[PDB]
Amino acid sequence: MILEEKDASDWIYRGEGGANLVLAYAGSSPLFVGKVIRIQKARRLTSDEQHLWRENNELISSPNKEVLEQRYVQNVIIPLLGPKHVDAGVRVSVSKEFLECVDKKVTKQRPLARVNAANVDTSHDSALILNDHSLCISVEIKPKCGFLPTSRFIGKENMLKTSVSRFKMHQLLKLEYIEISEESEYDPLDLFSGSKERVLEAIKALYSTPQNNFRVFLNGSLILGGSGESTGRTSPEIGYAFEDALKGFIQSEDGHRTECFLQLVSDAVYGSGVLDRLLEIQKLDKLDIEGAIHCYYDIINQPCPICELSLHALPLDESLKIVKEYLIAATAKDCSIMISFQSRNAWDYVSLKPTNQTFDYKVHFIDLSLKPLKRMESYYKLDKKIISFYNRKQ
Numbered sequence: 001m002i003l004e005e006k007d008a009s010d011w012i013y014r015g016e017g018g019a020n021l022v023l024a025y026a027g028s029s030p031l032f033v034g035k036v037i038r039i040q041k042a043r044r045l046t047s048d049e050q051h052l053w054r055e056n057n058e059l060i061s062s063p064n065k066e067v068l069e070q071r072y073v074q075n076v077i078i079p080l081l082g083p084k085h086v087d088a089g090v091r092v093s094v095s096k097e098f099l100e101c102v103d104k105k106v107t108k109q110r111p112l113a114r115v116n117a118a119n120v121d122t123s124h125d126s127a128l129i130l131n132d133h134s135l136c137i138s139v140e141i142k143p144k145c146g147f148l149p150t151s152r153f154i155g156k157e158n159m160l161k162t163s164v165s166r167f168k169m170h171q172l173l174k175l176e177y178i179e180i181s182e183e184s185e186y187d188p189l190d191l192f193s194g195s196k197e198r199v200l201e202a203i204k205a206l207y208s209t210p211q212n213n214f215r216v217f218l219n220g221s222l223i224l225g226g227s228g229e230s231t232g233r234t235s236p237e238i239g240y241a242f243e244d245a246l247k248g249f250i251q252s253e254d255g256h257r258t259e260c261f262l263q264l265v266s267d268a269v270y271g272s273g274v275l276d277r278l279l280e281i282q283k284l285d286k287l288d289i290e291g292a293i294h295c296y297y298d299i300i301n302q303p304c305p306i307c308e309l310s311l312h313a314l315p316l317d318e319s320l321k322i323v324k325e326y327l328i329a330a331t332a333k334d335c336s337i338m339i340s341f342q343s344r345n346a347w348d349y350v351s352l353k354p355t356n357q358t359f360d361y362k363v364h365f366i367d368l369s370l371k372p373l374k375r376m377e378s379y380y381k382l383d384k385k386i387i388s389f390y391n392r393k394q
């Protein structure tokens with residue numbers, strides 16, 4: 001396997017983040033049918049991190065960020081969340097001339113949002129081939145953190161943290177900085193509750209105010225939510241079009257499909273059990289950032305600007321493990337959930353009782369980033385800004 005210039009006519013632009021481009025397969029080859037390709041963009045491990053991750057040697061010995069992320073997903077994440085819901089991808093060889101071709105294609109096809117985005121990195125010789133999770137109604141949920149901290153290291157001035165989800169508090173700061181059109185009714189505690197009624201309530205809230213937490217795809221094309229944490233509450237107009245976009249797929253009368261869809265997503269999520277395993281990893285944040293931040297300053301060997309005498313007394317081994325676990329928690333807190341459906345016709349699944357319909361589903365965790373050690377400082381600063389603002393507004 002080696003991709004090159006004539007193969008580049010087989011891939012269409014799908015999307016991108018800050019670091020990677022995603023192209024979908026448009027060709028015919030039984031090899032890449034239902035596959036996407038992840039290509040590194042140009043930009044322009046540290047020893048501490050190498051010391052922090054020393055346990056997993058392959059990770060520290062990775063020659064580039066692509067390999068680093070794959071092995072983090074494969075070697076650190078998969079043992080925690082299980083292979084069933086995580087696709088780490090298959091590395092493929094790529095030629096410089098393939099990449100140079102993809103470059104020209106991306107600059108011509110990128111949406112307006114992305115017209116000045118970074119070039120493809122043409123020095124690279126590898127890309128990642130992954131299953132297309134959109135291929136089918138696809139539902140992407142960014143759930144955020146689903147528990148309330150109880151930590152001893154949370155001081156008396158910050159006690160609302162013990163009472164009010166980090167998400168709900170953040171909404172107020174977002175609304176202050178004019179980043180959202182209004183407060184979302186979504187509560188992660190509901191979604192992670194293990195309660196059927198509460199999950200459905202969460203899904204309805206996500207549908208109503210998607211922000212950047214709820215997107216729905218038809219065959220990989222956005223039919224709800226999308227670019228705009230800033231885009232507002234689902235309007236009559238948007239609601240109506242979405243209802244119609246569901247026609248044929250959900251077999252109910254005009255106007256009733258949306259409610260069946262929401263039920264379907266709710267049943268899939270609760271049924272799958274995927275939130276429980278995710279919640280466990282979020283809870284690898286055992287101390288709260290207000291605890292874990294002290295351990296951080298002991299790893300980078302610097303006086304602590306926060307000072308918790310006992311956290312600084314720990315042996316180095318135990319500090320490394322705590323930050324390590326916080327950082328893995330941070331992956332789980334910031335990942336997304338992709339639920340893919342297809343309807344069975346009369347000739348893992350969910351049923352709708354009024355419809356008499358059946359739906360295959362698959363669930364994957366996506367967006368599983370390795371968090372750089374240094375980010376602890378910004379984890380702390382954001383945390384301090386969130387609570388003081390909520391405190392100030394109470």
Ligand SMILES: [Zn+2]
Nearest residue numbers: 294304306307
């Ligand atoms: Zn300290």
